[PDB]
From a paper:
The first committed step toward l-phenylalanine and l-tyrosine is the conversion of chorismate to prephenate, catalyzed by chorismate mutase (CM). In M. tuberculosis, CM (MtCM, a dimer encoded by Rv0948c, aroQδ) has evolved to transiently interact with DS (MtDS, a tetramer encoded by Rv2178c, aroG) to form a heterooctameric complex. MtCM represents the structurally simple AroQδ subclass of CMs composed of two intertwined three-helix subunits.
In N-s4.15, this loop adopts a similar conformation as in EcCM, *MtCM, and MtDS-complexed MtCM that is distinct from the loop conformation in free MtCM. The activated loop is highly kinked, either because of Pro52 in the evolved variant or induced by binding to MtDS. Interestingly, the Asp55 side chain of N-s4.15 engages in a hydrogen bond with Arg18 from the other protomer across the active site, a catalytic residue that aligns well with the corresponding active conformation in the MtDS complex. The crystal structure of N-s4.15 shows that Pro87 introduced another kink, resulting in reorientation of the C terminus. Overall, most active site residues of N-s4.15 adopt conformations resembling the ones observed in the MtDS-activated WT MtCM. The crystal structure of N-s4.15 implies that its improved activity is due to a combination of pre-positioning active site residues for efficient substrate and transition state binding, tighter packing of the active site, and an overall stabilization of the fold, as reflected by the increase in the enzyme's melting temperature.
Residue numbers in the entry:
A (entry chain D), B (entry chain D): 11 to 88
Write the structure that this text describes.
Amino acid sequence: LPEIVTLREEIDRLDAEILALVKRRAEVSQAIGKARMASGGPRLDHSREMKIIERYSELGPVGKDLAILLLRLGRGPD
Amino acid sequence: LPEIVTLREEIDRLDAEILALVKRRAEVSQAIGKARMASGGPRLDHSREMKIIERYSELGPVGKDLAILLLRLGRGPD
């Protein structure tokens, strides 16, 4: 379709930004993981993680799955 | 942990931006879906969608799943 060329541009721009933000979030999450590890004790703040998941549910059920994936991106490289 | 207070702030800020970007992407994707529907013919550009998925694999295997979820967010509300 010729009339979707500019919509596709916008997608590509959005994806560039999403990827940068997700990468940064993975770095921050991993730093939080390293501080929690270093301190012994729970590897997650479960109440905190559940609240994040509930925020993402504003998007629908796919929103919960997104938060779940972002949670997995916070793991140490394994 | 007291030393993770500012890291948690950064997460919250990143999540605010991720959610706004994902919502916008869902709007654009749905507009592309509506143009494709209106035109009859394939509901997806499969080569295009596969290229998006491959870009997201730069993140790892979780990256492919992310692209997959974003693809589902582009559906008409159902």
